[PDB]
Design a protein around this nucleic acid. Structure first.
Ligand SMILES: [Zn+2]
Lengths: 204, 99, 60, 78, 154, 128
RNA sequence: GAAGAACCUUACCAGGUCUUGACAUCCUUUGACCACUCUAGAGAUAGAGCUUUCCCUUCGGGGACAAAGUGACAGGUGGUGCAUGGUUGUCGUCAGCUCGUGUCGUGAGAUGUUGGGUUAAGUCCCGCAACGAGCGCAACCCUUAUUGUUAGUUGCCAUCAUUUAGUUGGGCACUCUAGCGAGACUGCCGGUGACAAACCGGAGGAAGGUGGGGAUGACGUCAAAUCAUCAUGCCCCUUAUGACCUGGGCUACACACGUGCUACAAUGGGAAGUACAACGAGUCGCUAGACCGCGAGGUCAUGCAAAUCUCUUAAAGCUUCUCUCAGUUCGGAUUGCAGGCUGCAACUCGCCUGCAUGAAGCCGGAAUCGCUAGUAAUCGCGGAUCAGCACGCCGCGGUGAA
């Protein structure tokens, strides 16, 4: 293998961490509470289709935020769902949690959402080729600069594994002022587990 | 005099703007303020063998830095004292009021 | 066997010279940074995900 | 290297003093891997565990210094 | 190396006699990043030389040198793909290089238990054409032109 | 009164030279120049600035120093002298440059790299 | 892999032991488990003792919780890198690999990507049935070398005084700390060149021609490696390959090989004086200081959650004296005895100290490796894992060649 996780390079330089705090001498509880909370909202993603998670740090409380393409579905009917969040969270935390929400815009040009969708389609035994192609269809036409898409594994629920994908636009990688995103998902019907990885580029 | 404040964070912009804010809250009411004194910026180091079973050649080392600031003030009136007690923001950098 | 073992450490040990270190999410017995309580690879990866405050890549 | 006195485990001492009155029973099974030898042991007969089998061995006089583990070697080379 | 020749890093003169040769000889005694010791044996050897038959630590030195620095050399070249060794017109600088090299090395085996008696006696014997370094140069010149017949029109 | 200064840097060592009219002398850390220095007759090295301008006396030298070995900082005083003499007459800097000894030698210890025993040493390696 | 095998950790062997089981969820009764002591035990456990006790009440109830039961079951470092995801090694930091539209060929295919000039390079220029583009090269990034400015403590001491001292007065000049700026771009000179690209020399400048170093690894090859970090299809175990405990392994020794350290001494052995770095670690931890024992250390006490205090005056270096060419006063493997430290416990199987004994070994064949500069060679410092244990590994600095 040879390549480098691309949001593992622009981190710190032009894009910043997504857990903004500072903890000297208290640096395992904070980490393994952040991990706990980050894991336990995977229930929402089943339908809410969230993208990001921040972990701010109060004086003695927990302020976070999220983004998802459906604000009504997450907060619920009369905001009661967010209350179930609060009460499950503080019980999970032992610390007063103060959540917040912002709506994501142009949810086509994300990366985790797109991988979520194409893995979804691959679950329903659909042709990977047209899946990738219509993904990049709706993506590029939303206004972008380049997309690549890779798929690997026991393709078409078939014999010895392979990998191949298609790309339009143009995506420079070794350059740094790139702001390129990246997302990697998984699925399978009955043949082990497949692999899809997606890269976008939306400005330097 | 009898009050000072340390800073320890990672990105210098937040530290510097916190510095500007506290200097406002100090030289506003009274005077005799001290500037944003730089500091040696402690650094860490680690080394992770960039593989999973073998090949102890491919290393991948990471790091950590901690910029610092330091500001004392003289003749703190009851005004700016309580303004310090109430100023809390920003919330990315840890400060500590100290005599 | 990793489940019986992981269950072992969560108890108070039989004697003081027995409480070792082992990753939390994964369960590696060796080489766990006892500043973070992560194994070698899990910290490696999670650094990429922008979820450890601090850690970056070091060029000099 | 234990200048605060030597050491032998209690679940052997009480089981070796319990014969000081009468004659000694030929058997004292044990773990036999943490105990040095005290003067109160001469003339007994202690079997010694080697992780596989217990090894019956008596007690002489000069055989009083070292620990119990130096008589049932767990190597078995030949 | 492959593209073209390269620069040569000249040295400074000495802080006693002010000689580029003296420094260039002090350097060729040093072993393992330890210099001062070399300077000390150099100076002590020089004083010993000037003691018996006092003329100069420099003049008798150059005498021994011109006794040593060769004029030809067998340069193995396979123009005919074979073991042809052709006598070569040795360059100026490499002459001094080899002078110092043979001097120091072959003096190292002189065998005075004393620290620097080995060197002093060696250069004093070389200036008078007695010693294998002189024999070394004469042997080089006796193997050169030992085969200049079939190895010269090249 | 009249006093002249100038700094010098070599191999991560730094000396703070001070110049003043005297007889030709230098007091390194309140010590004679032959104390801080070992045996080292790399003193022609140190007076080498003088051997080209103000030849070869006579001012005095106050000097602080810290860092590096002896040879490093010894060479590192050579440059405070150059900068001080430069302060006197900007009519000298040409004859200094032509004789050099004015720019900071940036050679220094090498950043090593993981996997190699030294900065460039490669371990011995079995062929077959 | 292993960035810490005495127990463990720990999969493996001998013993002593359990079954919805050590770990998760449901359900029935429920309802709050603890913890504590004494016994028998190698413990696992067994057996008794005050006991696990309602945290909401609307009069009806709910969570943590056992314990029992109940079946839903869990469980596996068992199997297949040749069913797989992910993550690496190499060709290679080598300069290449491609496409859209036009055009050629009956077709596999070809043109672009070729020739001349140039270059670290598919880098640029020129001409050409090709016109244009993408991943690559480069540049955008980090650090090192000069410095303007903004700021002066726990940093600095020049102009003053005093004290053991930059300490304490006084100051922020310098040094340094660290933000924002500035600066190297063939920018100007000469020449060579088809006037192009580029190349040789020059000034100025701190650095001149990618200034030095790092991060950065294209299409793909090798069914390379990995179900033992994790995940996972299929196959399999299920009163046992699942599970608890003690003891031993993984440290076994006629032997063959790879990597390292100490050496075979006079540039040395010993004894005595004498100065100079840099990177980082520190609250149950770094020990100041003083006292004791020759030592490893112990005792009482001192600051330090930090530019303050400590690890920590670095070692080779420099100055004298002694030893005379010998298995030597070199070498100190090996071994007897007496100690030290952590540790519930150092025989198996720790590190270190004192005394005593004193092995092979006087530069190593055929063969073969590394290295172009602050490099090679040589000498110390720190820290990762970590009660404790480093000739390993990851960084730093000193001296300094051909
Ligand atoms: Zn882990």
């Amino acid at each position: 293998g040879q390549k480098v996780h691309p949001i593992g390079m622009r981190v710190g330089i032009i894009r910043d961490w997504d857990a903004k705090w500072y903890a000297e001498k208290e640096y395992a509880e904070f980490l393994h509470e952040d991990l706990r909370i980050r894991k336990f909202i995977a229930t929402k993603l089943a339908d809410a289709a969230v993208s990001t998670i921040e972990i701010e740090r109060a004086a003695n409380r927990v302020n976070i935020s999220i983004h998802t393409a459906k604000p009504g579905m997450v907060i619920g009917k009369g905001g009661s769902e967010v209350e179930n969040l609060r009460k499950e969270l503080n019980k999970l935390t032992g610390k007063r949690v103060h959540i917040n929400i912002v709506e994501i815009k142009k949810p086509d040009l994300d990366a985790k959402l797109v991988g979520e969708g194409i893995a979804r389609q691959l679950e329903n035994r659909v042709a990977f080729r047209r899946a990738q192609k219509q993904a990049i269809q709706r993506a590029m036409r939303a206004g972008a600069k380049g997309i690549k898409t890779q798929v690997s594994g026991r393709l078409n629920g078939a014999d010895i594994a392979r990998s191949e994908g298609y790309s339009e636009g143009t995506v420079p990688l070794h350059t740094l002022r790139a702001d390129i995103d990246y997302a990697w998902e998984e699925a399978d019907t009955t043949y082990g587990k497949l692999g899809v990885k997606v890269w976008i580029y939306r400005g330097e | 005099q009898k009050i000072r404040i340390r800073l320890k964070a990672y990105e210098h912009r937040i530290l510097d703007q916190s510095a500007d804010k506290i200097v406002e809250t100090a030289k506003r009411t009274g005077a005799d303020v001290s500037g944003p004194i730089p500091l040696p910026t402690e650094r860490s180091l680690y080394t992770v063998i960039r593989a999973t079973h073998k090949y102890k050649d491919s290393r991948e080392q990471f790091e950590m830095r901690t910029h610092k600031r330091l500001i004392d003030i003289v003749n703190p009136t009851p005004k700016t004292v309580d303004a310090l007690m109430k100023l809390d923001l920003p919330s990315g950098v840890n400060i500590e009021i100290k005599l | 066997a990793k489940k019986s073992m992981i269950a072992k450490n969560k108890r108070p040990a039989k004697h003081s010279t027995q409480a070792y270190t082992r990753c939390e999410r994964c369960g590696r017995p060796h080489s766990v940074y006892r500043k973070f309580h992560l194994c070698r690879i899990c910290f490696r990866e999670l650094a990429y995900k922008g979820q450890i405050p601090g850690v970056k890549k070091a060029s000099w | 290297s234990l200048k605060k006195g030597p050491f032998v485990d209690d679940h052997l001492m009480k089981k070796v003093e319990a014969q000081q009155g009468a004659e000694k029973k030929k058997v004292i099974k044990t773990w036999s891997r943490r105990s040095t030898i005290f003067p109160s042991f001469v003339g007994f007969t202690i079997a010694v565990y080697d992780g596989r089998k217990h090894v019956p061995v008596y007690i002489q006089e000069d055989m009083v210094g070292h620990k119990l583990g130096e008589f049932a070697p767990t190597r078995t080379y030949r | 190396p492959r593209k073209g020749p390269v620069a040569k890093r000249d040295v400074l003169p000495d802080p006693i006699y002010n000689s580029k040769l003296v420094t260039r000889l002090i350097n060729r005694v040093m072993v393992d990043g330890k210099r001062g010791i070399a300077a000390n044996i150099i100076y002590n050897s020089f004083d010993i030389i000037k003691e018996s038959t006092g003329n100069d630590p420099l003049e008798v030195f150059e005498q021994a040198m011109k006794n040593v620095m060769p004029v030809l050399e067998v340069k193995a070249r396979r123009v005919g793909g074979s073991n042809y060794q052709v006598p070569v017109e040795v360059r100026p600088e490499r002459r001094t290089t080899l002078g110092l090299r043979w001097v120091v090395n072959y003096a190292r085996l002189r065998g005075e238990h004393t620290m620097e008696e080995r060197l002093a006696k060696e250069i004093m014997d070389a200036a008078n054409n007695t010693g294998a370094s002189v024999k070394k140069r004469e042997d080089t010149h006796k193997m050169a032109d030992a085969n200049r017949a079939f190895a010269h029109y090249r | 009164q009249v006093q002249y200064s100038g700094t010098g840097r070599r191999k991560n060592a730094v000396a703070r030279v001070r110049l003043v009219p005297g007889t030709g002398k230098i007091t390194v850390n309140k010590k004679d120049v032959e104390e801080y220095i070992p045996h080292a007759d790399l003193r022609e090295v140190i007076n080498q600035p003088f051997g080209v301008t103000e030849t070869k006396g006579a001012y005095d030298v106050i000097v602080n120093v810290n860092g590096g070995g002896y040879a490093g900082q010894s060479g590192a005083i050579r440059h405070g002298i150059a900068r001080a003499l430069l302060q006197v007459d900007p009519d000298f800097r040409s004859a200094l440059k032509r004789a050099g000894l004015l720019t900071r030698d940036a050679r220094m210890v090498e950043r090593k790299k993981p996997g190699l025993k030294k900065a460039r040493k490669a371990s011995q390696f079995s062929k077959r």
